[PDB]
Amino acid sequence: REVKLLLLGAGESGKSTIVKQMKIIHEAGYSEEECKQYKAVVYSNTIQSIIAIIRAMGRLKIDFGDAARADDARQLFVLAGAAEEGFMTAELAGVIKRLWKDSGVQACFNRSREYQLNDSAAYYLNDLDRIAQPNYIPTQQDVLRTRVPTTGIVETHFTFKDLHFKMFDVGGQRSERKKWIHCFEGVTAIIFCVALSDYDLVLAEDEEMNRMHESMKLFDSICNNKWFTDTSIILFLNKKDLFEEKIKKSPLTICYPEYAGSNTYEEAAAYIQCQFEDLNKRKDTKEIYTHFTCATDTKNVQFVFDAVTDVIIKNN
Numbered sequence: 082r083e084v085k086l087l088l089l090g091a092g093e094s095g096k097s098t099i100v101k102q103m104k105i106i107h108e109a110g111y112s113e114e115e116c117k118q119y120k121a122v123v124y125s126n127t128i129q130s131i132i133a134i135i136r137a138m139g140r141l142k143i144d145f146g147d148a149a150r151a152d153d154a155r156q157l158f159v160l161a162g163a164a165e166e167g168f169m170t171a172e173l174a175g176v177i178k179r180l181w182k183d184s185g186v187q188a189c190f191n192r193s194r195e196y197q198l199n200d201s202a203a204y205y206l207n208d209l210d211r212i213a214q215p216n217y218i219p220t221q222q223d224v225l226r227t228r229v230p231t232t233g234i235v236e237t238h239f240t241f242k243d244l245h246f247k248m249f250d251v252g253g254q255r256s257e258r259k260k261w262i263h264c265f266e267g268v269t270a271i272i273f274c275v276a277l278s279d280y281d282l283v284l285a286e287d288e289e290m291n292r293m294h295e296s297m298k299l300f301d302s303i304c305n306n307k308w309f310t311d312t313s314i315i316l317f318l319n320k321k322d323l324f325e326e327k328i329k330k331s332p333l334t335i336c337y338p339e340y341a342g343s344n345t346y347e348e349a350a351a352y353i354q355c356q357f358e359d360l361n362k363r364k365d366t367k368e369i370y371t372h373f374t375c376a377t378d379t380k381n382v383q384f385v386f387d388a389v390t391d392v393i394i395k396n397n
């Protein structure tokens with residue numbers, strides 16, 4: 082009645098977000114006290130996001146739409162220290178709001194594939210009035226949107242369908258992959274996460290490596306590892322929401338030069354799925370269970386995980 086699930090995938094693929102969803106779906110969510118613990122994370126993520134955009138403006142040579150923002154940028158650094166401690170004054174919120182609304186800042190934001198920017202930047206910056214409110218308490222979605230790369234191994238437990246799940250989460254950044262092997266024993270199923278929207282991005286560890294290519298190499302290694310022959314391989318093609326928006330404006334040929342389909346979700350998503358599934362060297366004896374997901378969407382993850390659990394029960 083015990084099931085061990087191991088989450089694998091490159092950095093930023095959404096592994097830890099899936100972990101959070103298990104608590105929300107099967108453990109009644111994050112309590113008020115638990116949500117408050119994420120307040121400083123939300124504020125830090127928010128401040129780091131606007132700062133990253135401002136830093137990129139210097140690198141890409143983008144001016145502020147309105148010269149008055151120069152002073153707001155100065156004040157941002159003077160007041161930024163508070164956010165990290167869990168405090169968001171009306172003054173700091175005002176500074177961030179004006180910067181976020183600037184046309185130059187927006188021009189830079191829309192060129193984020195050229196630098197490293199948290200996926201939840203817009204989510205938080207567009208909700209400044211709410212998160213800056215007095216006595217602000219992060220919502221479940223706010224918690225799901227937080228970003229903190231995983232170092233070490235995280236173990237979570239929950240019950241579902243009369244089964245006791247033991248979920249293991251590890252970091253996917255290059256420096257953390259050496260630790261994956263510590264979790265290789267007795268795995269019932271591997272949930273390998275892939276950020277669909279990574280197709281036109283490069284690794285933060287190396288700007289010369291395409292993120293999706295890196296993910297493919299990792300999947301090739303895991304899926305074909307003889308050690309996992311009897312371990313169910315679940316493939317989560319994640320960030321489908323970001324992918325749907327991006328495929329409309331950024332050519333998939335950046336990642337796959339041979340792609341001949343249109344700049345639409347269905348054709349492009351199916352193509353990527355085929356690229357990953359084709360890495361399977363034993364197609365007749367090893368099955369991959371693929372699901373398209375939006376890890377921050379609780380309803381999507383609930384239905385997908387329900388489907389995944391059924392396969393695990395029937396196969397293992």
Ligand SMILES: Nc1nc2c(ncn2[C@@H]2O[C@H](COP(=O)(O)OP(=O)(O)NP(=O)(O)O)[C@@H](O)[C@H]2O)c(=O)[nH]1
Pocket residue numbers: 090091092093094095096097098099199200201225226227228229230231232251252253254274319320321322323374375376377378
């Ligand atoms: N829009 C969107 N954001 C997502 C999705 N999945 C994850 N994110 C966001 O992407 C960021 C990174 O997610 P996270 O789960 O930390 O990634 P990870 O694979 O655990 N990273 P690491 O390997 O470094 O530990 C978070 O801010 C999270 O909220 C998705 O499907 N859509």
Ligand SMILES: [Mg+2]
Pocket residue numbers: 096097098229230231250251252253
């Ligand atoms: Mg993580």
